[PDB]
Amino acid sequence: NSTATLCLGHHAVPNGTIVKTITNDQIEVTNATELVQSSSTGGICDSPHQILDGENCTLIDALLGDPQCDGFQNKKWDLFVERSKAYSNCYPYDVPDYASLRSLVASSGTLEFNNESFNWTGVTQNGTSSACKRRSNNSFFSRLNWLTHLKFKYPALNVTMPNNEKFDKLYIWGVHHPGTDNDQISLYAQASGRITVSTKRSQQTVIPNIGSRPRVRDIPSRISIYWTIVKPGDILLINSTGNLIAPRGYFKIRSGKSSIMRSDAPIGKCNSECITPNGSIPNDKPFQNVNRITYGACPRYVKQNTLKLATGMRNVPEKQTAIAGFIENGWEGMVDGWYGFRHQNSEGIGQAADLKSTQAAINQINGKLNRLIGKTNEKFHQIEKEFSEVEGRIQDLEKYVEDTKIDLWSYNAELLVALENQHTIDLTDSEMNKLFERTKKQLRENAEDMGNGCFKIYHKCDNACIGSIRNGTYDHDVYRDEALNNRFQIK
């Protein structure tokens, strides 16, 4: 009736989602996406990393050559998987600093072994035991050589092996601790004496200690395992009068991205970049709360089990019912755009989406999605994070380092999502406000702001006229005389 109404508005949905911003602990938005990965398939995917399933073998048993581990000879891995069911089935042994030898072999990622011809003239080689059976016969660790007397003589060993290669050699060797004096004499022909293994740059001396230990596979003796790395140009010197469990050669030691993980998860024929002890997990999300132990391109571990990133504007119910604009009011019936126009004129009541504002909001949200989704970084060999034995100081430090790290990342995650969500609310609010301001400016003196996100346009404004406003081609001069007469009439 000589005027029209033009309202600016934004969509709303019936099923919104609650997120956290800096301004609000809980604010409902039109949509959100989860940034914490909280589930796994439960299987370790055999691709794209080279998996070695230890089965009944620990890495150290596979290294020494426990008979059940013969199948592992010379294999490589990106990730060696050690099973809780694993058990030793050879001569009872220990490794002082077991954790370090495990770690250095794990990180090297290879069991490649090269035999060498040591001169063991004057002694008997290849000692075996019923505690270490291979194909039902008494045997021993494959990579070790139990030397004993020859004709009740054990002449002092003073044996050399030069490293004339261009790579390092890793030697694994041991000392036999007999149960009794009787065993000492029966095995080596004389009283126990120390073993010294040296190079130009290092030395280790180990004393065999006679005594009963609790029987394991009916063996009260023990073997203690040691290692030596020999550089190119250096020489291994082995010096012993008995009790030597000698090396048969060396392991290659390599550097790269290999590691070891304790897990009982089955190995699957599938492809996944991120491995945890619970199974492989997708790495689309920036964070995860599945396990602090990871290998590969993995989301960062956080304490939160959910963090929702807003991917839409504030969700505002439509006030119940004159058309009305965005002031405390969303439009559930606007389904082809995020922002738009509703009008009332001579020809009826209509709605149209505004593409520009809708696309600007969507583009920006997609931009932050692109920064946060599918952008994980790889980590490989790290520190251990679960422990089967009590140890004190070093373990306290390992645990505190990891606890510290997780709390700092959990804090970063919490802040990041609150900041991002505040920014999303601000940028989506801003597109609405800019649309309203642009429209106000077009209309000049031909309309007044009704306070509800709508303009009273003080002239006849048919469908084409409204279209000209929406398209940005409205010429205010054309209508100004009509509008001014209508606005500043005296009633």
Add this chain to the structure above:
Amino acid sequence: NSTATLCLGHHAVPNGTIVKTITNDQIEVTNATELVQSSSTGGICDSPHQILDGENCTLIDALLGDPQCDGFQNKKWDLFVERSKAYSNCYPYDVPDYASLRSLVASSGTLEFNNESFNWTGVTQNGTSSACKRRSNNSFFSRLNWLTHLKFKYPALNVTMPNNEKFDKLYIWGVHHPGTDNDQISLYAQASGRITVSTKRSQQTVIPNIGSRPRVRDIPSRISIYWTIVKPGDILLINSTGNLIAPRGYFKIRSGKSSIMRSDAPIGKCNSECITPNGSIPNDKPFQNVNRITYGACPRYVKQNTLKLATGMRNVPEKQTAIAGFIENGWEGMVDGWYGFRHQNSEGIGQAADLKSTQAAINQINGKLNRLIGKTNEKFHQIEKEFSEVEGRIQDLEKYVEDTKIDLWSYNAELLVALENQHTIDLTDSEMNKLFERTKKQLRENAEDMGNGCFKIYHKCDNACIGSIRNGTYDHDVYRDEALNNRFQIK
């Protein structure tokens, strides 16, 4: 005189406080609150954590059973407090890896001890010394058993103790290092020989070393202390020909939240969640600069001694004196609200608070207070952070881990408070701006913006009229003819 003035404004206070934002290193606000706890009472509150005051006893002395520590037998703790005055008063001893045994016992949180009947047939038990008096008589550590020859014989000990319990057993034992060959023979009847303590899964051999050490309580000998954990189903085997300081049984070893702290603070009858070596501290604040060593639900340690969180808007002096609005001007006389209205009309000059805007600002500030205040998290046994001896590598790492952690938290604290304060300034500024905009919209063509946060209303607007604007019931149509004539008159 045919018009009225309506000004929008906000309060101001005579005693504002300076805070930091992202925009300003120093900006005065109406009020702030401190987020760094910087004082302690100076006492350790005995509630709600179970405190054990070591008095003259270290934990290790209480474990071994130094006579002055007999009162500690079998006690438990959440926090064992070790005093600087503590001193040993029994046989001179050392503990290789003292720090680890201290740590593992501290974390276990119990001195529960179960006696066992070891078969020491063939030797004399219960050796004592004048260096370790109990009730004025020569004595020894309560939990240890100094075995010596019987009739100048010391038959080889080969003694067993199975763990048929469903929990782990912690055994503490030792080796006696005699001052001279004469002592060796007088005590054990033969030359010194090694001690081996083993289980199915582990072994330790220790060599007694004869020699003079500086006398302590007139004793040139030493005892060295060792420990062994025996799992259920396993067996302790002790094998010795002399110099054995034997266990009398085992300690329970538990897991939980127990720890140990070095402090000289007195223990008080009071209740506080957070304990530091300086005393308990309140844990209302998110940060603290009292001590990096903490136990319980504690604020996080930061380097800053103060961080002030704004709890009010910018504080702006009232310009000296026509009423005027918020543009570069606060209202010290507005004491019943944070924002409001001042008017001049036919009936005088008045002021009224706006509840809605005031409450919206207060609610939001209370929200951020609720997130930051009284929300501390608990930590228990951690790593040591002060050291009485120089050690090198491990200590360097312990110190660097803690330094690293504190710098990262101090950074987080600094950023958090700057961000929060910027947000507080922004949300309080926003309530002022929204109040002004809402008012502008009500007034439509009946008023003009005077540029100083006030409107010139171009009609007679009595107290009820002004009230209708403040209440949001003003009907612009009622006054529009009058206002338009007044606005667009030609003078």
Add this chain to the structure above:
Amino acid sequence: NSTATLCLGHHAVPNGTIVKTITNDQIEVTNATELVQSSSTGGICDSPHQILDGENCTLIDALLGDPQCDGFQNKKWDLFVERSKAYSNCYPYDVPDYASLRSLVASSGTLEFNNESFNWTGVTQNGTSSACKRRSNNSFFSRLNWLTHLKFKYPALNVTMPNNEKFDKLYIWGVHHPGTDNDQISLYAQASGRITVSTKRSQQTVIPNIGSRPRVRDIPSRISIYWTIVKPGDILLINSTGNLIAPRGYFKIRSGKSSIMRSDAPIGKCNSECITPNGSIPNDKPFQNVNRITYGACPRYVKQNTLKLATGMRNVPEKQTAIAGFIENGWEGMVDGWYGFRHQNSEGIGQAADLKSTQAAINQINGKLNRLIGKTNEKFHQIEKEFSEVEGRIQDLEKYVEDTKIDLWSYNAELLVALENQHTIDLTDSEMNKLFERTKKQLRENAEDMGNGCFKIYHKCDNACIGSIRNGTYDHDVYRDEALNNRFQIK
């Protein structure tokens, strides 16, 4: 022609720089500055820290007194620089826990040595070797004393040295491991026996181990090095029957800010606070990607090789050509200010800078520069971050601690710069918007907003009139009758 145009605008430059904000991965601004230091001179500046260039000597060789290191006696340092070319040229030795002794001496920062008169009655002193020549003669480590038999007797040593000083004493000593039984007898007159060095609070026993090691400088024997710290009031007791490499006195041990660094960078005559192995670097910037190893007041190490901080507003091309304001349009021709006014009136078309808005933007940007530039903090002795040997557990932890730290700082840097740049864009946009709003308010009913950042002023407004608007002295009442007639005329 009875009207004027007044446009508000901001500068633009032909050569802008791309930065990252929270809103945009790439946004062009007028200027930026680099926050990551990525180059070094390549030399270590000898000022202001006290540098000690080890040349051919490691710290440990300088400590023991290898002949080529005699020049180092008693010197101090802030930073000891160890060269890759360094080599030992004396008796072949090792140090169990070499890394710790290196670290504790490095951190102490002094080689100050005080000779003491030990009573070595009954033995020969000052043993020497061809493996350790000094001025072409057979010699030995300067700070050690190789004792051997006197007249084929080596009476048991039981020797004391009290610490009656008020500072700690650091004693360095050793054990000689002879190649053969023949050497043992030729040197010490009897079979090898253990060495015990003790105090009231500590003890160490070391066993000499006879055996061939690979010859070095024709020596198949080895010396193993040990250390003891003796507190004031305590006593050093040395107890040996042979194989003792005795101390000649003690080192002072101090506490302070000293460290050690591995580098081949030459030492220069220059002054720089921050030292890295690549050379000294400037410390103006808050971050650096030169080296994770640093000493002194240094930028923090990050993974990024560049982080650009915006130091100007968004850079917006001038739309091609009616004068026009800031809406999607910057002014390349405005060179004497950041914001300003362009006008068209009766007297022509002019431009003027607005000082207030320009200065407010510049001041704020300078403020954030002042917070970020030249504000680095000092760190001194830390942990090692590069390793020449494989070690396992401890090294894994050292590496993980540093990796963890760097990732957290790299994250903080990335967020900080994105946040700061967003704030810079917001504050510079805000000065433009405030200038426009201030102008709008002055003009009252005398102008209309043309939508392009300009006002149509509906009255004759000559150069003085425009000046009154720019100066904030424009009196709208003077022109209102003229303007209203022009605005609300009917055409």
